[PDB]
Design a protein around this motif. Structure first.
Motif, PDB file in Angstrom:
ATOM      1  N   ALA A  80       0.844  -1.175   0.000  1.00 18.76           N
ATOM      2  CA  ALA A  80       0.000   0.000   0.000  1.00 18.76           C
ATOM      3  C   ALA A  80       0.889   1.237   0.000  1.00 18.76           C
ATOM      4  O   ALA A  80       1.243   1.760  -1.058  1.00 18.76           O
ATOM      5  CB  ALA A  80      -0.894  -0.007   1.232  1.00 18.76           C
ATOM      6  N   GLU A  81       1.258   1.691   1.193  1.00 22.67           N
ATOM      7  CA  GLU A  81       2.091   2.879   1.322  1.00 22.67           C
ATOM      8  C   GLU A  81       3.427   2.575   1.977  1.00 22.67           C
ATOM      9  O   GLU A  81       3.502   2.365   3.186  1.00 22.67           O
ATOM     10  CB  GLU A  81       1.352   3.947   2.121  1.00 22.67           C
ATOM     11  N   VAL A  82       4.482   2.567   1.173  1.00 19.60           N
ATOM     12  CA  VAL A  82       5.817   2.301   1.673  1.00 19.60           C
ATOM     13  C   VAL A  82       6.759   2.088   0.511  1.00 19.60           C
ATOM     14  O   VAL A  82       7.944   2.409   0.594  1.00 19.60           O
ATOM     15  CB  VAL A  82       5.807   1.063   2.559  1.00 19.60           C
ATOM     16  N   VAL A 120      10.140   3.993  12.282  1.00 23.36           N
ATOM     17  CA  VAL A 120       8.948   4.420  13.011  1.00 23.36           C
ATOM     18  C   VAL A 120       8.115   5.308  12.087  1.00 23.36           C
ATOM     19  O   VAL A 120       6.884   5.279  12.118  1.00 23.36           O
ATOM     20  CB  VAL A 120       9.313   5.242  14.282  1.00 23.36           C
ATOM     21  CG1 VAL A 120       8.107   6.016  14.776  1.00 23.36           C
ATOM     22  CG2 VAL A 120       9.811   4.325  15.375  1.00 23.36           C
ATOM     23  N   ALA A 121       8.808   6.088  11.260  1.00 27.25           N
ATOM     24  CA  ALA A 121       8.170   7.004  10.320  1.00 27.25           C
ATOM     25  C   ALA A 121       7.171   6.294   9.418  1.00 27.25           C
ATOM     26  O   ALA A 121       6.460   6.933   8.644  1.00 27.25           O
ATOM     27  CB  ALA A 121       9.232   7.704   9.473  1.00 27.25           C
ATOM     28  N   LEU A 122       7.122   4.972   9.522  1.00 28.33           N
ATOM     29  CA  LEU A 122       6.207   4.178   8.713  1.00 28.33           C
ATOM     30  C   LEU A 122       5.111   3.523   9.552  1.00 28.33           C
ATOM     31  O   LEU A 122       3.972   3.396   9.107  1.00 28.33           O
ATOM     32  CB  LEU A 122       6.989   3.112   7.938  1.00 28.33           C
ATOM     33  CG  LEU A 122       7.505   3.496   6.545  1.00 28.33           C
ATOM     34  CD1 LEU A 122       6.651   2.810   5.489  1.00 28.33           C
ATOM     35  CD2 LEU A 122       7.470   5.009   6.359  1.00 28.33           C
ATOM     36  N   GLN A 123       5.450   3.097  10.762  1.00 32.14           N
ATOM     37  CA  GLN A 123       4.450   2.486  11.621  1.00 32.14           C
ATOM     38  C   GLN A 123       3.416   3.569  11.887  1.00 32.14           C
ATOM     39  O   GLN A 123       2.225   3.291  12.022  1.00 32.14           O
ATOM     40  CB  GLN A 123       5.063   2.031  12.948  1.00 32.14           C
ATOM     41  CG  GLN A 123       6.301   1.173  12.818  1.00 32.14           C
ATOM     42  CD  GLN A 123       7.095   1.125  14.106  1.00 32.14           C
ATOM     43  OE1 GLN A 123       6.757   1.802  15.079  1.00 32.14           O
ATOM     44  NE2 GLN A 123       8.154   0.325  14.122  1.00 32.14           N
ATOM     45  N   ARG A 124       3.886   4.812  11.966  1.00 34.06           N
ATOM     46  CA  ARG A 124       2.998   5.939  12.211  1.00 34.06           C
ATOM     47  C   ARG A 124       1.972   6.008  11.088  1.00 34.06           C
ATOM     48  O   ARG A 124       0.769   5.916  11.334  1.00 34.06           O
ATOM     49  CB  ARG A 124       3.793   7.253  12.298  1.00 34.06           C
ATOM     50  CG  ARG A 124       4.822   7.476  11.190  1.00 34.06           C
ATOM     51  CD  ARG A 124       5.444   8.875  11.285  1.00 34.06           C
ATOM     52  NE  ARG A 124       6.020   9.328  10.018  1.00 34.06           N
ATOM     53  CZ  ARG A 124       6.423  10.574   9.778  1.00 34.06           C
ATOM     54  NH1 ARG A 124       6.316  11.503  10.718  1.00 34.06           N
ATOM     55  NH2 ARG A 124       6.935  10.893   8.596  1.00 34.06           N
ATOM     56  N   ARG A 125       2.447   6.157   9.854  1.00 29.72           N
ATOM     57  CA  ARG A 125       1.556   6.221   8.701  1.00 29.72           C
ATOM     58  C   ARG A 125       0.980   4.837   8.464  1.00 29.72           C
ATOM     59  O   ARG A 125       0.625   4.495   7.344  1.00 29.72           O
ATOM     60  CB  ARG A 125       2.311   6.691   7.456  1.00 29.72           C
ATOM     61  N   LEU A 126       0.909   4.044   9.528  1.00 30.06           N
ATOM     62  CA  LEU A 126       0.376   2.690   9.455  1.00 30.06           C
ATOM     63  C   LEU A 126      -0.491   2.427  10.682  1.00 30.06           C
ATOM     64  O   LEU A 126      -0.030   2.525  11.821  1.00 30.06           O
ATOM     65  CB  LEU A 126       1.522   1.677   9.383  1.00 30.06           C
ATOM     66  CG  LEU A 126       1.878   1.177   7.980  1.00 30.06           C
ATOM     67  CD1 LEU A 126       3.263   0.557   7.978  1.00 30.06           C
ATOM     68  CD2 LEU A 126       0.841   0.165   7.536  1.00 30.06           C
ATOM     69  N   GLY A 127      -1.753   2.092  10.441  1.00 29.77           N
ATOM     70  CA  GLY A 127      -2.675   1.847  11.533  1.00 29.77           C
ATOM     71  C   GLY A 127      -2.265   0.784  12.533  1.00 29.77           C
ATOM     72  O   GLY A 127      -1.313   0.035  12.312  1.00 29.77           O
ATOM     73  N   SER A 128      -2.995   0.739  13.645  1.00 28.70           N
ATOM     74  CA  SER A 128      -2.769  -0.227  14.711  1.00 28.70           C
ATOM     75  C   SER A 128      -4.136  -0.592  15.278  1.00 28.70           C
ATOM     76  O   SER A 128      -4.622   0.062  16.198  1.00 28.70           O
ATOM     77  CB  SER A 128      -1.897   0.383  15.796  1.00 28.70           C
ATOM     78  N   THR A 129      -4.756  -1.627  14.718  1.00 24.95           N
ATOM     79  CA  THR A 129      -6.078  -2.065  15.159  1.00 24.95           C
ATOM     80  C   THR A 129      -6.178  -2.224  16.669  1.00 24.95           C
ATOM     81  O   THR A 129      -5.181  -2.120  17.387  1.00 24.95           O
ATOM     82  CB  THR A 129      -6.480  -3.408  14.519  1.00 24.95           C
ATOM     83  OG1 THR A 129      -5.763  -4.475  15.149  1.00 24.95           O
ATOM     84  CG2 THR A 129      -6.172  -3.402  13.039  1.00 24.95           C
ATOM     85  N   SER A 130      -7.393  -2.481  17.141  1.00 26.71           N
ATOM     86  CA  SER A 130      -7.655  -2.653  18.566  1.00 26.71           C
ATOM     87  C   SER A 130      -7.269  -4.047  19.044  1.00 26.71           C
ATOM     88  O   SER A 130      -7.614  -4.447  20.154  1.00 26.71           O
ATOM     89  CB  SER A 130      -9.130  -2.393  18.855  1.00 26.71           C
ATOM     90  N   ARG A 131      -6.547  -4.783  18.207  1.00 28.11           N
ATOM     91  CA  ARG A 131      -6.129  -6.134  18.558  1.00 28.11           C
ATOM     92  C   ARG A 131      -4.615  -6.296  18.467  1.00 28.11           C
ATOM     93  O   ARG A 131      -4.023  -7.104  19.184  1.00 28.11           O
ATOM     94  CB  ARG A 131      -6.809  -7.156  17.638  1.00 28.11           C
ATOM     95  CG  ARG A 131      -7.602  -6.548  16.486  1.00 28.11           C
ATOM     96  CD  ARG A 131      -7.205  -7.167  15.149  1.00 28.11           C
ATOM     97  NE  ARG A 131      -8.365  -7.560  14.350  1.00 28.11           N
ATOM     98  CZ  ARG A 131      -8.420  -7.491  13.022  1.00 28.11           C
ATOM     99  NH1 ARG A 131      -7.379  -7.041  12.334  1.00 28.11           N
ATOM    100  NH2 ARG A 131      -9.515  -7.874  12.378  1.00 28.11           N
ATOM    101  N   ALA A 132      -3.997  -5.524  17.580  1.00 29.08           N
ATOM    102  CA  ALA A 132      -2.557  -5.579  17.372  1.00 29.08           C
ATOM    103  C   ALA A 132      -2.186  -4.574  16.286  1.00 29.08           C
ATOM    104  O   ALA A 132      -3.055  -4.076  15.571  1.00 29.08           O
ATOM    105  CB  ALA A 132      -2.144  -6.989  16.952  1.00 29.08           C
ATOM    106  N   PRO A 133      -0.889  -4.263  16.146  1.00 25.18           N
ATOM    107  CA  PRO A 133      -0.463  -3.300  15.123  1.00 25.18           C
ATOM    108  C   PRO A 133      -0.698  -3.789  13.695  1.00 25.18           C
ATOM    109  O   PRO A 133      -0.922  -4.978  13.465  1.00 25.18           O
ATOM    110  CB  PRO A 133       1.026  -3.089  15.415  1.00 25.18           C
ATOM    111  CG  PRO A 133       1.255  -3.689  16.784  1.00 25.18           C
ATOM    112  CD  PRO A 133       0.248  -4.776  16.928  1.00 25.18           C
TER     113      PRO A 133
END
Length: 321
Positions: free
Chosen positions: A103-105, A297-310
């Motif tokens: 997707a984005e990366v 980290v600059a990517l995990q940020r622009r990457l969601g983290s559901t209510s179950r896990a990243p």
């Protein structure tokens, strides 16, 4: 040296008295030398009631005799959210597991491959170079407080060691997985079978149980090896990537034996996530699988983290036997 200063000595010294008590006491590891310790309270004692309007059952002097220090797993909220992790039983699963970044990366952000240290996770909140509290995973939103027991653990340093190009963050909520080395566990058990308790089925328990002791003494006697594996909420750091944080944690004193492998392309990890099988037993720890992690980290940020896990770190899992 008035009242305002009185405190800047009173509580200012208590925090050092109980500091050593605990050390000397339930933990059996003295920092100073008995003379010194016996010299502090002595000062604090007389010059405590010397200020009656500053004495109470909480005074480490006229109270902190033998015991007093004891764990009681008091429900305490966390700070981040401390989520779990997805899972990959099949390799072709991993494909997407990270290929989702398609997707984005640009399928390029550096994936970090780590060892899955099967055990009991704990979170550490270092308020200003020192350890404030220590909760358990719990419901993820709030967990049990095993500060004392955690403090008693080896690898966990009650105080951070400043230095390098990294300044002691005014918080640093670090996540890690306290566990037991096979042998150390095989000893604890062997040194039991019953005569008080019973042998532990699997170490995950040997540890948990150990760390879950109301009387820190038990927890302090037990080995246990924490391994601060993941950063959490921070306020005075904020680095560019996971590892760049690891280098910083290391310079801080926290345990980071993440047999990492800064990888690139699905190939780089496909191998390491296939090498830890026929050669994944030499470890003194107990890894059940591997977990890839978008490094920057600059990517995990622009990457969601559901209510179950990243949404940025699947966790490959190698099926038992």
């Amino acid at each position: 040296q008035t009242a305002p200063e009185v405190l800047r000595q009173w509580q200012a010294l208590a925090e050092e008295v109980r500091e050593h008590q605990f050390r000397y006491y339930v933990r059996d590891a003295p920092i100073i030398s008995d003379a010194e310790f016996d010299e502090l309270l002595r000062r604090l004692e007389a010059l405590e009631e010397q200020h009656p309007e500053l004495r109470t059952p909480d005074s480490p002097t006229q109270l902190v005799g033998g015991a007093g220090f004891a764990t009681d797993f008091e429900p305490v909220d966390h700070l981040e959210r401390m989520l779990s992790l997805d899972n990959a039983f099949t390799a072709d699963e991993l494909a997407a597991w990270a290929g989702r970044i398609h997707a984005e990366v640009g399928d390029a952000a550096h994936y970090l491959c780590e060892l899955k240290i099967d055990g009991v996770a704990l979170s550490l909140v270092y308020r200003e170079g020192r350890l404030t509290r220590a909760s358990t995973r719990g419901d993820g939103r709030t967990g049990e407080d095993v500060t004392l027991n955690a403090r008693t653990i080896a690898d966990v340093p009650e105080r951070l060691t400043p230095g390098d190009d990294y300044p002691v963050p005014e918080v640093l909520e670090v996540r890690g997985e306290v566990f037991f080395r096979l042998d150390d566990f095989q000893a604890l058990n062997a040194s039991l079978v019953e005569e008080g308790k019973a042998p532990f089925a699997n170490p995950r328990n040997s540890a948990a149980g150990s760390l879950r002791q109301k009387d820190p003494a038990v927890t302090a006697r037990r080995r246990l090896r924490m391994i601060c594996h993941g950063l959490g909420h921070v306020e005075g750091f904020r680095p560019a990537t996971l590892h760049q944080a690891y280098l910083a944690l290391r310079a801080w004193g926290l345990p980071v034996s993440e047999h990492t492998t800064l990888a690139t392309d699905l190939a780089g990890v496909r191998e390491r996530i296939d090498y830890w099988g026929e050669h994944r037993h030499e470890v003194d720890h107990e890894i059940d699988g591997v977990v890839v992690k978008v490094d920057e980290v600059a990517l995990q940020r622009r990457l969601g983290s559901t209510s179950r896990a990243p949404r940025w770190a699947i966790a490959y899992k190698y099926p038992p036997e």
